Design an enzyme around this catalytic site. Structure first.
Site, PDB file in Angstrom:
ATOM      1  N   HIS A 295       9.660  63.486  52.259  1.00 23.67           N
ATOM      2  CA  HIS A 295      11.057  63.100  52.180  1.00 23.67           C
ATOM      3  C   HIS A 295      11.492  63.061  50.722  1.00 23.67           C
ATOM      4  CE1 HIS A 295       8.335  59.701  52.439  1.00 23.67           C
ATOM      5  NE2 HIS A 295       9.197  58.938  51.793  1.00 23.67           N
TER       6      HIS A 295
ATOM      7  N   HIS B 162       8.154  63.913  48.255  1.00 24.48           N
ATOM      8  CA  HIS B 162       6.894  63.204  48.101  1.00 24.48           C
ATOM      9  C   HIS B 162       6.407  62.754  49.468  1.00 24.48           C
ATOM     10  CE1 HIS B 162       9.847  59.969  48.286  1.00 24.48           C
ATOM     11  NE2 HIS B 162       8.866  59.191  48.706  1.00 24.48           N
TER      12      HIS B 162
ATOM     13  N   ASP C  98       4.409  59.329  51.056  1.00 26.14           N
ATOM     14  CA  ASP C  98       4.251  57.924  50.709  1.00 26.14           C
ATOM     15  C   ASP C  98       2.781  57.579  50.513  1.00 26.14           C
ATOM     16  OD1 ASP C  98       6.882  57.363  50.626  1.00 26.14           O
ATOM     17  OD2 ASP C  98       6.951  56.093  52.409  1.00 26.14           O
TER      18      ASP C  98
ATOM     19  N   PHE D  77      15.403  61.557  43.469  1.00 25.17           N
ATOM     20  CA  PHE D  77      13.952  61.456  43.522  1.00 25.17           C
ATOM     21  C   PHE D  77      13.444  62.626  44.349  1.00 25.17           C
ATOM     22  CE2 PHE D  77       9.812  59.658  44.729  1.00 25.17           C
ATOM     23  CZ  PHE D  77       9.393  59.160  43.509  1.00 25.17           C
TER      24      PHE D  77
HETATM   25  C1  LIG Z   1      12.192  56.379  48.891  1.00 25.39           C
HETATM   26  C2  LIG Z   1      12.305  54.892  48.595  1.00 25.39           C
HETATM   27  C3  LIG Z   1      11.206  54.118  49.303  1.00 25.39           C
HETATM   28  C4  LIG Z   1      12.302  54.622  47.079  1.00 25.39           C
HETATM   29  N1  LIG Z   1      11.196  55.288  46.413  1.00 25.39           N
HETATM   30  C5  LIG Z   1      10.043  54.656  46.162  1.00 25.39           C
HETATM   31  O1  LIG Z   1       9.874  53.459  46.380  1.00 25.39           O
HETATM   32  C6  LIG Z   1       8.901  55.506  45.606  1.00 25.39           C
HETATM   33  C7  LIG Z   1       8.641  56.670  46.554  1.00 25.39           C
HETATM   34  S1  LIG Z   1       8.069  56.163  48.197  1.00 25.39           S
HETATM   35  N2  LIG Z   1       7.706  54.696  45.453  1.00 25.39           N
HETATM   36  C8  LIG Z   1       7.083  54.543  44.283  1.00 25.39           C
HETATM   37  O2  LIG Z   1       7.531  54.986  43.229  1.00 25.39           O
HETATM   38  C9  LIG Z   1       5.767  53.808  44.339  1.00 25.39           C
HETATM   39  C10 LIG Z   1       5.872  52.339  43.956  1.00 25.39           C
HETATM   40  C11 LIG Z   1       4.560  51.592  44.162  1.00 25.39           C
HETATM   41  C12 LIG Z   1       4.583  50.165  43.564  1.00 25.39           C
HETATM   42  N3  LIG Z   1       5.046  50.147  42.168  1.00 25.39           N
HETATM   43  C13 LIG Z   1       3.204  49.522  43.694  1.00 25.39           C
HETATM   44  O3  LIG Z   1       2.521  49.235  42.733  1.00 25.39           O
HETATM   45  O4  LIG Z   1       2.846  49.335  44.930  1.00 25.39           O
HETATM   46  C14 LIG Z   1      13.630  55.023  46.462  1.00 25.39           C
HETATM   47  O5  LIG Z   1      14.685  54.710  46.971  1.00 25.39           O
HETATM   48  O6  LIG Z   1      13.521  55.725  45.372  1.00 25.39           O
HETATM   49 FE   LIG Z   2       8.852  57.551  50.019  1.00 22.25          FE
END
Ligand SMILES: CC(C)[C@@H](NC(=O)[C@H](CS)NC(=O)CCC[C@H](N)C(=O)O)C(=O)O
Ligand SMILES: [Fe+3]
EC number: 1.21.3.1
Length: 329
Positions: free
Chosen positions: A268, A212, A214, A209
């Site tokens: 991150h 980005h 948060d 990933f």
């Molecule tokens: C970095 C981690 C937190 C995780 N990534 C993630 O969770 C990534 C980046 S923070 N987050 C997302 O895609 C957003 C999800 C939001 C959720 N569907 C909602 O409607 O609220 C991973 O392990 O990929």
């Molecule tokens: Fe994140």
């Protein structure tokens, strides 16, 4: 040569008590970590993360393709036009390794006024069949309020760290309208691992990933004990050490907005590691109409020229932007 980030372990238990001096000492450590790399581990948090990891594993490993289709968000199922946030996020064999399940405030029911008004980002959770996954929904809903309580305490620490009264953030973090979400992410072991799910960073690192910020006020993350996260510093990316007993904490871009980038939202990314692991973030979001006046802790008067940002508008634009940049998860 990749160096390791200084991620301190903070005992957050005083934030649940009434020792005001002990809370301030916690607040100082939160301030220091938020001004350094932006990550700290919350320890002595009171949450049974062992039961969390086991119940999430049993769910991930026993769900069938039929149930995934029935729970799929509209990105994977055209029939579910109302599910944009809550539901199952399917992996694509040979193409996409990650899969996840997201659920929102359990108080969001058809009787809820935000659902009645069809307010964006508000959805009614979908769940698997109770007889196929016994007690999963009860566990998941209970966990939501467990981590809610922990996040409410952390927000008291962040407020005190910024010189505000301890309910500065928490007063907007309410059980009846919070847009916070839990995401139960599975990262599978795959042999062979599909190269289409591995992205190469500019510096040559293999990623699951990309970089980005948060979309959150803060993020409260549990992960199993497999190292994977990297935080960007001015000297490059640094590895974040894994700790499957504590919660990893960082600010999102809404915190950076209201503090005039005093507490930055750390950039991150997730390194690619071929290992069965879990990533279980709780995204601390406020209410749809929640507004916090931006301020600048650097200035004596604390005055800021940044416009107040409605959390609902912030969250809707942020979730779409994150998809456009880093891809549908
Ligand atoms: C970095 C981690 C937190 C995780 N990534 C993630 O969770 C990534 C980046 S923070 N987050 C997302 O895609 C957003 C999800 C939001 C959720 N569907 C909602 O409607 O609220 C991973 O392990 O990929
Ligand atoms: Fe994140």
């Amino acid at each position: 040569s990749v160096s390791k980030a200084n991620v301190p372990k903070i005992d957050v238990s005083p934030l649940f008590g009434d020792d005001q001096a002990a809370k301030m000492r916690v607040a100082q450590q939160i301030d220091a970590a938020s001004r350094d790399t932006g990550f700290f581990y919350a320890v002595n948090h009171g949450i049974n993360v062992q039961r969390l990891s086991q119940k999430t594993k049993e769910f991930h490993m026993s769900i069938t393709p039929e149930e995934k289709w029935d729970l799929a968000i509209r990105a994977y199922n055209k029939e579910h036009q109302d599910q944009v946030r809550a539901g199952y996020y399917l992996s694509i064999p040979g193409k996409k390794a990650v899969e996840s399940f997201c659920y929102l405030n359990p108080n969001f029911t058809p009787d809820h006024p935000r659902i009645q008004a069809k307010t964006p980002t508000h959805e009614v959770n979908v769940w698997p069949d109770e007889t196929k996954h016994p007690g999963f929904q009860d566990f998941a809903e209970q966990y939501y309020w467990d981590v809610f309580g922990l996040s409410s305490a952390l927000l008291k620490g962040y407020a005190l760290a910024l010189g505000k009264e301890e309910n500065f953030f928490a007063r907007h973090f309410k059980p009846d309208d919070t847009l916070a979400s839990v995401v139960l992410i599975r990262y599978p072991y795959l042999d062979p691992y599909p190269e289409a799910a591995i992205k190469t960073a500019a510096d040559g690192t293999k990623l699951s990933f990309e970089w980005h910020e948060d979309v959150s006020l803060i993020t409260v993350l549990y992960q199993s004990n497999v190292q994977n996260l990297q935080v960007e510093t001015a000297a490059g990316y640094q590895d974040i050490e894994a700790d499957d007993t504590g919660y990893l904490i960082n600010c999102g871009s809404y915190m950076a907005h209201l503090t005039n980038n005093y507490y930055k939202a750390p950039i991150h990314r997730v390194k690619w590691v071929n290992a069965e692991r879990q990533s279980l973030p709780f995204f601390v979001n406020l209410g749809y109409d929640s507004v916090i006046d931006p301020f600048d802790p650097r200035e004596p008067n604390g005055k800021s020229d940044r416009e107040p940002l409605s959390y609902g508008d912030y969250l809707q634009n942020g979730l779409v932007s994150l998809i456009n940049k880093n891809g549908q998860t």
